[PDB]
Ligand binder design. Structure first.
Ligand SMILES: Cc1cc2nc3c(=O)[nH]c(=O)nc-3n(C[C@H](O)[C@H](O)[C@H](O)COP(=O)(O)O)c2cc1C
Length: 383
């Protein structure tokens, strides 16, 4: 329990903050007074393709339908209306008791350069897993994905971060999330990136590795390991049961296996940039594999990759450095969730949690002062 504000005392570059901001313009108005703060809006970008217009002008917001967040359907994906469309449908309904503020007069609508991209405003689409990829193959949805991203790219100069995308088969384990390792995948991503660019917006691929959050039975079917930092602490009882039934026990990664993941991160980043992406974001949050190394609950290792703040941060920072070298610091961002407890991370109950994340922020600032500043740090807010 606590605040992410500590990061601003350490890292001096752009910071994207996400969590419960759409219904709190009064909070946003204060936050964007800081000249390097951007705001990610998740659930309300799902439900409002023209969210940026509505934020600028202080318009009512479309309610979101959580039941279709992960359903294999166009409904709840590409059929939420723009405000003028909604008025034609007689919707004038919208979110209840919400008092909108026109935020057009604030830094939210001031231009900012992120990486190589000239953003025209600071409302960012954060990564949103929608589970509409095709199985087998983890292929971006050929029916609706281009339309979905095109709708949400509609305001010129919008930064879009894609839903988490698996860097390899071993990195995955959900059948209906997309990957970025194969040619059939990249054929569809190219179409998505083209459409976003045709709308004068920008796109960054979130690179995803599941670790203990993967489904051990899916991995077992595909001849893959069930991976984490350690082999003596498990995500939850269901996952423990699944691993036992699939005869696929959680496996503590060897140093060579870590190296192989780094190789796959580099290849996935290269694939993304080749297909037209503006950059990549490393998912080191929400209790996935990198987070499993950062967190002392999940990381009980006694080698170079656990047992101290520096050791726990080593995998995340190795991935950062490998990507910076491969594609350039201006095309790399990093996502963190210091207070998260999702997927059995520790959050603020771990007294050393701020130190762990302060260390990572400090190492990023150190690299920046030496000439290699990441495009951004993206923080999950405990809101
Ligand atoms: C349906 C859904 C899918 C999400 N998928 C991802 C994801 O793939 N990667 C990630 O880092 N965060 C993901 N998040 C977290 C969001 O990026 C973001 O932090 C959150 O939506 C912000 O809170 P808000 O919905 O109140 O704006 C997801 C959130 C939701 C609701």
């Amino acid at each position: 329990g606590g605040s992410n504000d500590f990061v601003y005392s350490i890292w001096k570059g752009p910071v994207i903050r996400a969590g419960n901001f759409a219904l709190h313009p009064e909070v946003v108005r204060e936050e964007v007074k800081d000249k390097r703060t951007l705001i990610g809006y998740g659930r309300f970008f799902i439900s409002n393709p023209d969210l940026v217009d509505r934020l600028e002008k202080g318009l009512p917001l479309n309610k979101y339908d959580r039941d279709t967040f992960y359903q294999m359907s166009a409904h709840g994906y590409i059929d939420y209306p723009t405000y003028e469309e909604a008025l034609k449908l007689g919707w004038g309904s919208f979110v209840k008791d919400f008092k909108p503020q026109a935020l057009g007069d604030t830094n939210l609508f001031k231009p900012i350069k992120i990486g190589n991209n000239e953003l025209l405003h600071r409302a960012v689409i954060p990564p949103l897993t929608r589970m509409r990829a095709l199985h087998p193959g983890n292929i971006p949805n050929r029916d609706w994905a281009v339309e979905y991203y095109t709708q949400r790219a509609q305001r010129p100069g919008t930064m879009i971060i894609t839903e988490g995308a698996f860097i390899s088969p071993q990195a995955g384990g959900y059948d209906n999330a997309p990957g970025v390792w194969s040619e059939e995948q990249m054929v569809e991503w190219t179409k998505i990136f083209n459409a976003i660019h045709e709308k004068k917006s920008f796109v960054w691929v979130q690179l995803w590795v599941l670790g203990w959050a993967a489904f051990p039975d899916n991995l077992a079917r595909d001849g893959l390991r069930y991976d984490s930092a350690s082999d003596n602490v498990f995500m939850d009882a269901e996952q423990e049961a699944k691993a036992k039934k699939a005869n696929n026990p959680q496996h503590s990664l060897t140093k060579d296996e870590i190296k192989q993941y780094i190789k796959e991160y580099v290849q996935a980043a290269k694939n993304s940039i080749a297909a037209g992406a503006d950059g990549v974001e490393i998912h080191s949050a929400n209790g996935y594999l990198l987070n499993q190394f950062l967190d002392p609950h999940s990381n009980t290792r006694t080698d170079e990759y656990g047992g101290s703040i520096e050791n726990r941060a080593r995998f995340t920072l190795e991935v950062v450095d490998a990507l910076v070298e491969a594609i350039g610091h201006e095309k790399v961002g990093l996502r963190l969730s210091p207070y998260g407890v999702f997927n059995s991370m520790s959050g603020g109950a771990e007294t050393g949690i701020v130190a762990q994340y302060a260390y990572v922020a400090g190492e990023l600032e150190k690299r920046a002062k030496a000439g290699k500043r990441l495009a951004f740090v993206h923080l999950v807010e405990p809101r």
